[PDB]
Amino acid sequence: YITQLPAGANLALMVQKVGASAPAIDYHSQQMALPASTQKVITALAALIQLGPDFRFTTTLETKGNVENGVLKGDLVARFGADPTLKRQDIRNMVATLKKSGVNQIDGNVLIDTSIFASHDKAPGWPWNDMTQCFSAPPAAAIVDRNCFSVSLYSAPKPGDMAFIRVASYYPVTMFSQVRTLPRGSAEAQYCELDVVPGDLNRFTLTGCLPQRSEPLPLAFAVQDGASYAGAILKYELKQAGITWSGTLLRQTQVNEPGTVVASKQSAPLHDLLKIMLKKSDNMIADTVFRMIGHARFNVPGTWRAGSDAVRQILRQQAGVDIGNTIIADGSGLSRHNLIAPATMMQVLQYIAQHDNELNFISMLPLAGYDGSLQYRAGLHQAGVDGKVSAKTGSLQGVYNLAGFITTASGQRMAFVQYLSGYARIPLVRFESRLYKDIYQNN
Ligand SMILES: *C(=O)[C@H]([C@H](C)O)[C@@H]1N=C(C(=O)O)[C@H]([C@H]2CCCO2)S1
C-alpha cells in the first residue's frame, strides 16, 4: 500500500476510530515491538490512576531526638522522595528552615534516607554505555538538579601533555584526567576514543585522546551515586548555615518511622509533571514516577519489578486492558526489554480517549505544529495535519514510533499506533505524508 519505504524496515500499524469495534487500518498490529518513548503514554495513564493528578513528590528534613539549647541530641534525617525537580536551592532553603527552627548543632549523625526506593537505580535492559549521559541518569530517590553536571575539557598547549578538566566547585564530584593531547596530525586520532569511566563516590576518570583544540570541549555527565551527591550538597549547606555535627554522613536504606518534619519541599502537582514528561519525553520524570507507582500500590520500597507488576495490574483492573505477553521494564521507554504490540497500545489509547474528560490527558501530548517533539515533523506538516494530531514520539537509532490521536476532516477522532523500526529522512517523510493525509481526508 503506502508500505514502500526501505525494505530493511519493520512496520506494525493500527488505526481505529475512538469507540469503534474494528480498526480502519490494521497491519501486523499483533506483532510486538520496541515502544521506545511511547512507553511514557502507559506510564502517564497508570500514574494518574494510581497517584492522581494532585500527587506531589516530597522531600523532608526530620529530627529524631530532643533539641536542647540549639543542640539536636540525635540524628538529622534528610528523607528523599525521588522528586525529579529538586534543586540545590531547595536544599539550601530547607537547611535555612532547620536553622530558623533553632537547631545550631547536631550531636549525632546526618542520615541520607532513600528508603522510599530499593534495589538498583537503573532498570533492567538499559544499555550500560549511556549510563554516564544525562538523558539516562539513574533516577534515584536522591536527585538534585537532575543528577547532571558539566565539565570543561582543555587540551594541553604541548602535545603529549595531559588534557585538563575544569569543573565548578559547587559540583561534589571528583574528576581525573588521563587524556593525552594529540598533535593536529596524529595517526592516533582515528581510533583513539575519548571516554568517561565512572568510579565509586562520584569519581570520574576521562581517558584516551583529545586532538589539540582552541576552545574547551564542554561535557555533561550523569551522577552515578545520587545519595552521596545529595549528602555532599547537604553537608555543604549545613556548614554554610553554621550548623555543626559530631557524627558522620550515613545512608539510611531501610524503612523507618518518620521523625518530626522541620522542613519540606513538594514538587509541582503530578498532572503538571506528566505534561512536561509527555511534551519533552523526560526520562527522569517518567522513571521516578514509575517506581513511585509500585511503592504506592504495594506499600513496599519502590523497585523496577514492583513498578512493572503495578502498571500491569492497574491497566488490567482499572483500565480493562490485559496486556498479556507485553513486557514493561520501565516508565521512560529506555529499556530495550520493553516489548508491546500496537493492538495492546491501542487498548490503552482507546481507554484514554474514552476517559479524556476525566483524565485531561490528550491536552498533555505534543500537538503537531505547536509543541513537544511534534512542533515540526515534516511528514505530519506535509500531510496537512498540523493542529490535528496529538501524539507521543518514540525515537531511537532507526526507530520512528508514533502513538496518539488524529482528528479527521469529518471531525472524528481516530487513535493510532505506528511502530516502525530498522529504518536506514525522505522515505519516512513520504510515508508519513501519505499515511496521515489519507487518514485525515478519508475518515
Ligand atoms: C524516547 O524515545 C527516548 C527515550 C530515551 O527512550 C527519549 N526521547 C528522545 C527524543 O529524541 O525525543 C530523547 C533524546 C534527547 C537526547 C538524547 O535522547 S530520549
Swiss-Prot record:
The active site is at residues 37, 40, 281. Pathway: Cell wall biogenesis; peptidoglycan biosynthesis. It holds the Pfam family Peptidase_S13. SUPFAM superfamilies: beta-lactamase/transpeptidase-like. GO terms for biological process: cell wall organization; FtsZ-dependent cytokinesis; peptidoglycan biosynthetic process; peptidoglycan metabolic process; proteolysis; regulation of cell shape; response to antibiotic. It is an enzyme of class 3 (hydrolase). The keyword Hydrolase applies. Its main location: periplasm. One of its GO terms (cellular component) is periplasmic space. Keywords: Antibiotic resistance, Cell cycle, Cell division, Cell shape, Cell wall biogenesis/degradation, Hydrolase, Peptidoglycan synthesis, Periplasm, Signal. Substrate binds at residue 392. The keyword Hydrolase applies. Its EC number is 3.4.16.4, 3.4.21.-. Residues 65-238 are annotated as: Absent in class-A beta-lactamases. It is found in: Periplasm. Disulfide bonds: none annotated. One of its GO terms (molecular function) is serine-type endopeptidase activity. Not involved in transpeptidation but exclusively catalyzes a DD-carboxypeptidase and DD-endopeptidase reaction. This is D-alanyl-D-alanine carboxypeptidase DacB.
